[PDB]
């Protein structure tokens, strides 16, 4: 309910510790278009314990929601947000076309296409370095074979 | 003495939940088997019959329920499910969505 959300290029990550994880409130903000849990039960959330809890939030397209799952590929998975092959959690997604859409174009939310390799689980990618696709290098200004990675 | 043949349609990654003692959406809130179930589980891919190019929406699975289903019990109730912290008069709206 922050009324503001970040892109998958700079997805937020909140620390959850020294607090009572009251999971009885998440049912009041979204209709749960895609509520998929992997390592835990939807009802046993209030009857378990964990070492540390992390809540990652970002904005992606509708076709990219299926990539937020263990063992998935794609631009969001391999280059923006990678989940481990043994992830134990729940994924929550809901439509935001009524709130996060602008008639003049909401160019705020971005995403990285590909940067020379795939990413590791739970890591950031904020380096805005120019991407090189050819044999001759290039820096500073974009151009032929020197495309922005976003 | 008596043989019961239960028939239904689920996805591929949900066939493993039909085994006894499993945990999941199909095992808990859709179809639960006891820990001492005696019988055989049979499943085959019917994508050629139970799928449409525009989407076959005639098959439904219960997402969330008040509690896990008892073994060999059925819940055909299509009543809207309340999930929020405030009453919704049993009608579709905020904090209250369809269970199926």
């Amino acid at each position: 309910n922050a009324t503001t959300f970040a892109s998958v290029y700079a997805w937020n990550r909140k620390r959850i510790s020294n607090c009572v994880a009251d999971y009885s409130v998440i049912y009041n903000f979204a209709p749960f278009f895609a509520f998929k849990c992997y390592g835990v039960s939807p009802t046993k959330l209030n009857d378990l314990c964990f070492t540390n809890v992390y809540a990652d939030s970002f904005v992606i397209r509708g076709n990219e929601v299926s990539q937020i799952a263990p063992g998935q590929t794609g631009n969001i998975a391999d280059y923006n947000y990678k989940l481990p092959d043994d992830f134990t959690g729940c994924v929550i997604a809901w439509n935001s076309n009524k709130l996060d859409s602008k008639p003049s174009g909401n160019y705020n939310y971005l995403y990285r296409l590909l940067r020379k390799s795939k990413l590791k689980p739970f890591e950031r990618d904020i380096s805005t370095e120019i991407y090189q696709a050819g044999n001759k290098p290039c820096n500073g200004v974009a151009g032929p074979n020197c495309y922005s990675p976003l | 003495t008596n043989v019961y043949a239960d028939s239904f349609v689920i996805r591929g990654n949900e066939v493993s939940q039909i085994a006894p003692g499993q945990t999941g959406n199909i095992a808990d809130y859709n179809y639960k088997l006891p820990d001492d179930f005696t019988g055989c589980v049979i499943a085959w891919n019917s994508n050629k019959l139970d799928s449409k190019p525009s989407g076959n929406y005639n098959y439904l699975y219960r997402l969330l329920r008040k509690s896990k289903l008892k073994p060999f019990e059925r819940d055909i109730s299509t009543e809207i499910y309340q999930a929020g912290n405030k009453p919704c008069n049993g009608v579709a709206g905020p904090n209250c969505y369809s269970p199926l």
Partner: antibody
Amino acid sequence: QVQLQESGPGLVRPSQTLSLTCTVSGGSVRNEYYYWSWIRQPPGQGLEWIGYMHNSGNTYYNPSLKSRVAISVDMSKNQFSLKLSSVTVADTAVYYCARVDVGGTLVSTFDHWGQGILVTVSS
Amino acid sequence: EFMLTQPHSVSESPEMTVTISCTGSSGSIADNYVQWYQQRPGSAPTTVIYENYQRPSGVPNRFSGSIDSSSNSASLTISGLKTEDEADYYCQSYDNSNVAVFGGGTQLTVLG
């Protein structure tokens, strides 16, 4: 690694049934997450899809010659067969085996292709 | 019936960048995956771009795939041509009825 190999008569005649079979090595044909397809490539033209078949018996065909194709699968010998019907002089091409990946969220590339067999149709 | 149309011939001097694109006419290009198969003349095809953004291990990083949803087309960017890159590239996708759709075939060659 996994590899495929065509096998069948390299020369047929019209008014007959083109029968082929691909021997699979390095993997079981009874394994799911994979379809077993047949790709056609006439000499000088592009590729043409004939049809893939799942191990569960679900056989998907090409609408161009669906009424003149048939695919089978044998879990014992790890070989899937192709059987056309009413072959013509235009059906001669290089047939390639291919295993498609049906693993994640969608159908995807033919990861492993065979060596390709060139057959001709002439009476 | 979903179809894919790509240029018949593409030619450019070495060390430059080419572009082969396939446009879907009777359907969408984002509903199914698009794959590019580099078929060397006289040998079987081989996947170089799959899942519209992924390249298999061993294939040089000179290849890259892209998807254009506004134009309903799928392009292939090859920067830094080489002598062995004179093979044919086939753009393949799937119809909504689970029918594999192959492109027309594009002959790429370096201007030696």
